[PDB]
Amino acid sequence: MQYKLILNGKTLKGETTTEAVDAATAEKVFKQYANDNGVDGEWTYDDATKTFTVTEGSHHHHHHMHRDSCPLDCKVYVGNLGNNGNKTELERAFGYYGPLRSVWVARNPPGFAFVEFEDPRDAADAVRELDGRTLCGCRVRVELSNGEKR
RNA sequence: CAUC
């Protein structure tokens, strides 16, 4: 019986078919043809239209409509926290919403500090649920850090 | 939004 395959990639994309028994032969035929175009992403199958797919993430190229919202932008600010310069509380508070990359706190009876996350969405979620309330024992103004010029 |  014949089966289909789609090679959804950034630049090289396409589709083909083959005579097989089922996935037990189609899943060891398309593996060659896909690598001959050069795709080798998410190996998929549809059990109602009998059509494989391989949505690319292996030919080492991708871009879309993003720039000033990347892993570089993840720096954050926190202040009016309460008298604490030990980082541990705010560090687990930050990394709780999602993994950090760096944390800083000052030297003179502080209640003010700085932070950097790994995903800019970890910083965004943290900023959205750490602000204007309380964390250590104060009112926590929490913002993205303005401390850059590219 | 710096006390590094």
Swiss-Prot record:
Superkingdom: Eukaryota
Domain called RRM: residue spans: 74-147
Biological process, per Gene Ontology: cellular response to leukemia inhibitory factor; mRNA cis splicing, via spliceosome; mRNA export from nucleus; primary miRNA processing; regulation of mRNA splicing, via spliceosome
GO-annotated cellular components: cytoplasm; nuclear speck; nucleoplasm
Positions where N6-acetyllysine occurs in the chain: 87
Chief localization: nucleus
Record PTM text: Phosphorylated by CLK1, CLK2, CLK3 and CLK4. Extensively phosphorylated on serine residues in the RS domain.
Modified residues (Phosphoserine): 69
The protein's assembly and partners: Interacts with CPSF6. Interacts with RBMY1A1. Interacts with SREK1/SFRS12. Interacts with NXF1. Interacts with YTHDC1, leading to recruitment to RNA elements adjacent to m6A sites. Interacts with SRSP; increases SRSF3 binding to specific exons.
Protein name as it appears in the record: Serine/arginine-rich splicing factor 3
Native organism: Homo sapiens (Human)
Gene that encodes it: SRSF3
Residues of the full protein shown: 1 to 86 of 164
